[PDB]
Amino acid sequence: GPLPRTVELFYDVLSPYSWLGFEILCRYQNIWNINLQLRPSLITGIMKKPPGLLPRKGLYMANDLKLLRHHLQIPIHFPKDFLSVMLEKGSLSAMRFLTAVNLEHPEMLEKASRELWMRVWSRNEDITEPQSILAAAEKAGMSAEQAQGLLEKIATPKVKNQLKETTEAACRYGAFGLPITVAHVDGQTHMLFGSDRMELLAHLLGEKWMGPIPPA
Amino acid sequence: GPLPRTVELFYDVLSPYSWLGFEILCRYQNIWNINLQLRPSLITGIMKKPPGLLPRKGLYMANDLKLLRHHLQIPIHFPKDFLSVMLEKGSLSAMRFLTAVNLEHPEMLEKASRELWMRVWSRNEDITEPQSILAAAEKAGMSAEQAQGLLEKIATPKVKNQLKETTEAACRYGAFGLPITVAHVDGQTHMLFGSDRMELLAHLLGEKWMGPIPPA
């Protein structure tokens, strides 16, 4: 039959909306005729303040994630401590780990990514310490040795360069933030920003949109 | 039967995404059990730069409106001249006119608003000159005298104050930009930003989402 359309998702586990778009795409990956390609990326390679105590956009995000938790049925929870803190700690080791997973055991990438989001954006757990990464990896179903082997590659030139190259690809697609979803279909390439454009994606693909929680 | 839910749309004809959200809402106004309340507002009362020649977000908007023209079937066209120019000229008279229409002939507000968007965001026509406003009003189906009568009220304290008050209401709902859609349902008030959250709105209302172009 006709070849599946490649849909690339560029994401960083530090991004709440990246998780939301990720889950919607994963839900459609065996329904639509697509080749979902996960692209672990680093927001700090892309991103190029209000004096008010409680900025309007910050309030909006807090309210929005509350609604989207229910709408998408994803257990996303705003962190108990300052967002600034999670963000300052960063996701470098985590994204390098996911890059290593992509290179060695791509079939584990989806669950590994989900488990890291579950730490940072569901349970408010650290994702910068080695033990933290390993905990997520083992929850994803990786063996301790497998996870430890991948952990040891986080700082290798190959993994560091792959993450840079993937992040650069996002930039070349016009990314000003994550997530971006890139569909290659009908002889064109389309970049969509955020988690709220999946119905438009469906239309680009000529596929049926059944909402953020499609049936069996 | 149960009372319709009030859904407020705060908009400025200078905003392209306000037009898009407007049309989707107007399409559902007699399908869902809602009382659609149009709220003419002024972006300049709410809004509180990249050195690069062609900023990424500007490219994104250009590409996005191209896709959305087809997805929503709305004849939106990026202006031939600099956006900065349309924006510098502003929409003050136009939004005051629409405020006057809301106060005197609310049943004409939908078409009057549409015709002003058709000028600025479809045909790249001026919306600051009196003759421009009148042209849109007459296209909406207003009599020349009716339109002229409203035009003469643009600078009255009553109209000026109403526009300020409406814009202030948007601010009090947390607006950091337009459009915002405010649904009062199930004992809560929810503010949604932009034109891409209408499926979420449907879910809040317990109504069926049939895409941006619902059937008869």
UniProtKB/Swiss-Prot annotation, chains A, B:
Entry annotated with the keyword Lipoprotein: no
GO cellular component, one term: extracellular exosome
Top-level taxon of origin: Eukaryota
Reaction it catalyzes: RX + glutathione = an S-substituted glutathione + a halide anion + H(+)
Subcellular location: Peroxisome
Modification N6-acetyllysine, positions: 66, 80, 111, 153, 160, 164
InterPro entries: DSBA-like_thioredoxin_dom, GST_Kappa/NadH, GSTK, HCCAis_GSTk, Thioredoxin-like_sf
An MF annotation (GO) of this entry: glutathione transferase activity
Main location: other
CDD domains to which the protein is assigned, alphabetical: DsbA_GSTK (cd03021)
Binding of glutathione, residues: 15-17, 178, 195-196
Function, in words: Glutathione S-transferase that catalyzes the conjugation of glutathione to exogenous and endogenous compounds. Significant glutathione conjugating activity is found only with the model substrate, 1-chloro-2,4-dinitrobenzene (CDNB).
Subunit structure: Homodimer.
Protein name: Glutathione S-transferase kappa 1
Originating organism: Homo sapiens
Gene from which the chain derives: GSTK1
